[PDB]
Amino acid sequence: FRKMAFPSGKVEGCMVQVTCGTTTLNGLWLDDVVYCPRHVICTSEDMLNPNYEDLLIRKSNHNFLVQAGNVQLRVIGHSMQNCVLKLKVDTANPKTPKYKFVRIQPGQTFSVLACYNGSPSGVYQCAMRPNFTIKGSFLNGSCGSVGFNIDYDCVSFCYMHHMELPTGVHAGTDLEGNFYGPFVDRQTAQAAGTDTTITVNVLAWLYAAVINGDRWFLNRFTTTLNDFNLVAMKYNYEPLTQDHVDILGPLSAQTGIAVLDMCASLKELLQNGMNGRTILGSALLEDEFTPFDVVRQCS
Amino acid sequence: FRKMAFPSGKVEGCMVQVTCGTTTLNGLWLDDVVYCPRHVICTSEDMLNPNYEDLLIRKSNHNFLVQAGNVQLRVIGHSMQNCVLKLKVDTANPKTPKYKFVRIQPGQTFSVLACYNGSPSGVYQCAMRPNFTIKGSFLNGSCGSVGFNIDYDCVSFCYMHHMELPTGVHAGTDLEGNFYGPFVDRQTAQAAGTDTTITVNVLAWLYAAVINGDRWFLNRFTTTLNDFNLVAMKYNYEPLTQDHVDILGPLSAQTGIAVLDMCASLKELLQNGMNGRTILGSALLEDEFTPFDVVRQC
Ligand SMILES: *[C@@](O)(CO)[C@H](C[C@@H]1CCNC1=O)NC(=O)[C@H](CC(C)C)NC(=O)c1cc2c(OC)cccc2[nH]1
Ligand SMILES: *[C@@](O)(CO)[C@H](C[C@@H]1CCNC1=O)NC(=O)[C@H](CC(C)C)NC(=O)c1cc2c(OC)cccc2[nH]1
């Protein structure tokens, strides 16, 4: 049981390079539109406090160098959707897959294809933290990198990368250009809200450990759902809903461990610690596997 | 600092399924050859104690169903090399990347593209353990999934999946069909040697910690490589080879910390513990980041 990402081939066939002036970053080429972060039009001076509509109107179609591999594509139009720039090109991407743009909720996961200069560099899995950051690996020039999920050769794009907070976590937008969280595409040091742990995900991961023969954390006790949430919120865990309980059903039936039994086990682990032991190799309670993630991988 | 796979699409373009009777696994289609585990020719009952040479004499080119998607590729030749079947087909794969077959060393990492019925399913990073197993995630129908590294648009194929040991780790061959480790493609309970900590990767991790300013563990002493190997074995840590010292070179140069000085720092960590302190936030020493992986992320 490892953190598994979706195969990235369908998304690699879409990453291009977008250059405006001195600024370079990645774009996503679907059909005859190239999507990228709008701050590619900014100078270093602009980025301190940019007026984007104002800065964009002074731009021409020919200010934008879009390169797909070696081939350069000609921009025949440009418009802005929130923090995302849409560049119209005169050529449709033949590798465009069946796609959709979604906005994911906190706690859900996606694969991140990290690109630099329009070249895919690596893929890994991430979750939308409850404070709307993501704990990624992104260096300089990774803006435009997108996150996504795949459902029967339909790619749901849910994230485009824009910034690293001073704490080392990352922030970005959906493909409509709306940031996840209270962040703004300005060159300013920005803090996030207090992060919390994704509870339904930690439980899904405990189930995965049992399905794989780890049971040392289990116990005899049970807890009411409200009493578990009292302890949970004390340790900065998100509360557990009845929906979350049903989402976990399969894993409960698969293992024969009732959700509320699994909540007693997790409750003790938060009160007692792990005593130096490990679960599925981790010394920490892991919260970036969703129940579906676990289900898909174990069956 | 996280586990990060290579992009998988260059390998996706080469996954097909190979079927004999009712045994289906995955195969690897490069030019006009398809590579897959030879036990595809076995019925489940022959797998218990197969005679691959006897079994192969009775199969013919028309016993092999190779499908790219729902599309059949006609098999026009077949040979067996070690534990892999090599099926010559009548179409060169137009998505064939530039590629090589390489046999990796324990400690090295690669990406795995888990496949089922010739359809990619997921991708993740593995390290070859010193006991020649890997801690993968494979289900039924995963055999023939491959592991690979990419350097400068060149895919180096290094692993092909054959089995799950009772302990739940996995084992397989290089792309010439030679098992990593003392395992055999028989349907049988097999046991790997005791695992050990991958020292070269632990040292890579300490370099990573220094690059990011976490360097409390740097000590004032040095060591010889023979002495470090001897003590490390006493803590269940792999000895270092000359090649291990060399692939540590760029990280040694970037930090100014000589390799044998960093060994003495690790030796002190081994004999005195971490004293509740952490390194890169963690209390455990991480051993599945090669020096390449550390640089690749900096
Ligand atoms: C994109 O590459 C931008 O073209 C870049 C990616 C980050 C660079 C280092 N690692 C990355 O993930 N993004 C940025 O530089 C963004 C640009 C904004 C959205 C206009 N800015 C930041 O990530 C940023 C700014 C500041 C800051 O200011 C002052 C202070 C502290 C942190 C910080 N991060
Ligand atoms: C391939 O899918 C098979 O073509 C399959 C993959 C494993 C199934 C579960 N997870 C996997 O990684 N491989 C096998 O089933 C192989 C087939 C051999 C090479 C003929 N066998 C095993 O992995 C196997 C057999 C036995 C066993 O026997 C008895 C006892 C214990 C473990 C075990 N593993």
Author numbering:
A (entry chain B): 3 to 301
B (entry chain A): 3 to 300
Question: Any passages from the paper?
Answer:
The main protease (M pro) of coronaviruses plays a key role in viral replication, thus serving as a hot target for drug design. The recognition site of coronaviral M pro depends on Gln at the P1 position, and no proteases in humans share a similar cleavage site. PF-00835231 is an inhibitor designed for the main protease of SARS-CoV that emerged in 2003, but its clinical trials were suspended due to the rapid disappearance of the SARS outbreak.
The resolution of the complex structure is 2.21 Å. SARS-CoV-2 M pro is a homodimer in the complex structure and can be divided into three subdomains, namely, domain I (residues 3 to 99), domain II (residues 100 to 199), and domain III (residues 201 to 300). The narrow cavity between domain I and domain II contains the inhibitor PF-00835231, which is present in both protomer A and protomer B. An enlarged view of the narrow cavity revealed that PF-00835231 occupied the S1, S1’, and S2 subsites of SARS-CoV-2 M pro in an extended conformation. The lactam ring of PF-00835231 occupies the S1 pocket of M pro, and the nitrogen of the lactam ring forms hydrogen bonds with Phe140 and Glu166 directly or via a water molecule (W) when the carbyl oxygen of lactam forms a hydrogen bond with the nitrogen of His163. While the leucine moiety of PF-00835231 occupies the S2 pocket, the indole group of PF-00835231 occupies the S4 pocket of M pro. The carbon of the indole methoxy group is covalently bound to Thr190, which is specific to the A-chain.
